[PDB]
């Protein structure tokens, strides 16, 4: 009788494939042909933030587009004013093997974590006048790879244990858990409304999650290898994924299919980080070959390079207001690009 | 304000100079073979921080990259080891590490453990590794087995390195093991400098 469910699965899969083919009317290339090419994107370094002692794993800006937090495996969070290159804070971490860091939207807290399997939440505003650990979120069984605040009281994390989790900060507990990936979840990205989020894992698939309901709504495949990086398109109706197969791919949520591939014969290294510009006409990818590429995300033609690092580009970030790009690198520098 | 800002910056950079002094005087080691255990020890007033990554999920290809700049990877193998062929598993892991592009300049201190287990067993090994019937040493039987395993590892090791990293194998008594790690890290740094000056 076990064949009944095998047949149910066969039929459901065939129906999904047929409904997928049905919707493929045109291709992004086609609908875009007339569009003007972006041009040539010549950005320059405007700041070199120096002071980290070892490679930088993660950075996150902060909604004011002036302060940014960076995490280095030298064991430091540094909070920088980017206008003046002055260090606002230097937080020493209990565990040095940090892999992600988040800047809360209100500016009052930062969050970090890594191989310690903990998400630590640090307070930045105290009558005393010193940054202290306000919370430790424990409950994951693999390394923390990414975290993001929904607000001062909630934070969503992703782990090498193949799960994501929503946490209530004041009580230290794990309200919702998101399961369904079969590989390490490497990156998450909050939808600009914070009701959904997408995750990309080492099973070459990306999943869409409802935060309240707590279940998986859609799955996306098409990459050949691990997805290292994921970032929502600014209107929350599509996302982009960078992989070890040396491509980027753009996926639409309501078409339920891959829309675009960004690859070149000469590029044979993996993507480490992705981020859209403010309008989503440029896609910025960091690579293992020490560069960043700037893709015209509507035409799939490479429009620029950022070559200012001597080691792996680990992280990218675009400011909320769209004025600056930050690159972090294994050479232990941050560069601001305009 | 723009004055207090420069003051706080000066203060932070004082602290950072101190931190740098500390950081560059400590040596980080990856032990291999609640997310991460951490051990500290000191030999001849040189400080070491060895990290044991238990608490991960046995797909290593992502988190191993955190260790691209340690002074050394310590790789422990249970040589003698429903019996599964675990020696070929250890060899394949060693080979993946040796040829990973982010670990290429990292040297590996190789500990071959349970040599008494071997001394008792060899009296099971030629079922796998049939070449063990032709190999000769560079009782005699346990010596042969032991050195044959070492040579499999060193064959993988010399096949690809090309100068930038080496393998330091030992047959494994804590005191002596820490002294071995110390002397090998010293050799590693000396060889890095000697190769920078084009003397190796």
């Amino acid at each position, epitope marked *: 009788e076990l064949d009944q469910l095998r047949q149910e699965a066969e039929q459901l899969k065939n129906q999904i494939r047929d409904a997928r083919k049905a919707c493929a009317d045109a291709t992004l290339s086609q609908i875009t042909n007339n569009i003007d090419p972006v041009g040539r994107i010549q950005m320059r370094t405007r700041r070199t933030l120096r002071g980290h002692l070892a490679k930088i794993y993660a950075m996150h800006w902060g909604t004011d587009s002036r302060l940014l937090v960076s995490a280095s495996q030298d064991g430091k969070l540094i909070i920088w004013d980017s206008y003046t290159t002055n260090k606002v804070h230097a937080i020493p971490l209990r565990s040095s093997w940090v892999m992600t860091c988040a800047y809360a939207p209100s500016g009052n807290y930062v969050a970090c974590g890594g191989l310690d399997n903990i998400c630590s939440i640090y307070n930045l505003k105290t009558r005393e006048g010193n940054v202290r650990v306000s919370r430790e979120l424990a409950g994951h069984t693999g390394y923390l790879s990414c975290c993001r605040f929904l607000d001062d009281n909630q934070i969503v994390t992703s782990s090498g244990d193949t799960t994501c989790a929503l946490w209530d900060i004041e009580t230290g507990q794990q309200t919702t858990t998101f399961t369904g990936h079969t590989g390490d979840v490497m990156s998450l990205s909050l939808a600009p409304d914070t009701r959904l989020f997408v995750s990309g894992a080492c099973d070459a698939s990306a999943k869409l999650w409802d935060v309240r309901e707590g279940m998986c709504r859609q799955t996306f495949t098409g990459h050949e290898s691990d997805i290292n990086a994921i970032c929502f398109f600014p209107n929350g109706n599509a996302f982009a994924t960078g992989s070890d197969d040396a491509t980027c791919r753009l996926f639409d949520l309501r078409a339920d299919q891959e829309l675009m591939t960004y690859s070149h014969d000469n590029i044979i290294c*993996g993507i480490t980080s992705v981020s859209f510009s403010k309008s989503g006409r440029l896609l910025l990818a960091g690579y293992d070959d020490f560069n960043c590429n700037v893709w015209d995300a509507l035409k799939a033609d490479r429009a620029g390079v950022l070559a200012g690092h001597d080691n792996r580009v680990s992280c990218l970030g675009v400011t909320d207001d769209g004025m600056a790009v930050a690159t972090g690198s294994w050479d232990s520098f941050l560069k601001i690009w305009n | 304000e723009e004055k207090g800002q420069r003051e706080a910056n000066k203060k932070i950079e004082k602290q950072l100079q101190k931190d740098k002094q500390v950081y560059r005087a400590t040596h980080r080691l990856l032990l291999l073979g609640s997310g991460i255990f951490e051990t500290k020890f000191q030999v001849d007033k040189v400080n070491f921080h060895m990290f044991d990554v238990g608490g991960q999920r046995d797909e290593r290809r992502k988190w191993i990259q955190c260790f691209n700049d340690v002074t050394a990877i310590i790789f422990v193998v249970a040589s003698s080891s429903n019996q599964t*062929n675990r020696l070929q598993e250890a060899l394949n892991l060693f080979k993946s590490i040796w040829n990973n592009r982010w670990l290429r300049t990292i040297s590996v201190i190789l500990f071959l453990n349970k040599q008494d287990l071997l001394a008792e067993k060899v009296l099971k090994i030629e079922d796998y590794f*049939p070449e063990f019937a032709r190999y000769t040493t560079p009782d005699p039987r346990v010596t042969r087995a032991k050195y044959f395993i070492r040579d499999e590892f060193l064959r993988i090791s010399t096949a690809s390195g090309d100068g930038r990293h080496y393998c330091y194998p030992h047959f494994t008594v804590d005191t002596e093991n820490i002294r071995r790690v110390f002397n090998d890290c010293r050799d590693i740094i000396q060889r890095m400098h000697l190769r920078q000056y084009e003397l190796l």
Partner: nanobody, 130 residues
Framework: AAQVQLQESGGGLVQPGGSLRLSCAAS????????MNWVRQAPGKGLEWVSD????????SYTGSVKGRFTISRDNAKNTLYLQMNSLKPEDTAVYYC?????????????????????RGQGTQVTVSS
């Protein structure tokens, strides 16, 4: 949406000493860019690497138990991996999986024997007995 598929076939029941030819059809990726492996799991045992072939077909490696009896081949034109099994012994009864290496254009091959590796097939059962 395309997926990474590794479908094995050819397994069956044979006598000790007989021959089998295992095939693995690949889909979803560019076959030529990837190192390929055969792995197996026996009754009450872990996953054991059996063999691997490189992108072009030049480099080959075997676990000792089979060297001399098993021959791995790749047909890059048809996206197929083959294992020719000769003079089979009753200690080969197992399930056999074709495992792709995680990343292309690479020399290291991590995690292809792990319990929940993603780029593996379902398997094919080989049973050597009378």
């Amino acid at each position: 949406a395309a997926q990474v598929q590794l479908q094995e076939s050819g397994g069956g029941l044979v006598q000790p000493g007989g021959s089998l030819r295992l095939s693995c059809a690949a889909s979803g990726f560019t076959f030529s860019n990837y190192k390929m492996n055969w792995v197996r799991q026996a009754p009450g045992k872990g996953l054991e690497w059996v063999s691997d072939i490189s992108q072009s077909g030049a480099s080959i490696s075997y676990t000792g138990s089979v060297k001399g009896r098993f021959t791995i081949s790749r047909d890059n034109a048809k996206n197929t991996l083959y294992l020719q099994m000769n003079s089979l012994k009753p200690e080969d009864t197992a399930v056999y999986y074709c495992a792709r290496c995680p990343a292309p254009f690479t020399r290291d091959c991590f995690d292809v024997t792990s319990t929940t590796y993603a780029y593996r097939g379902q398997g094919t059962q080989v049973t050597v007995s009378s």
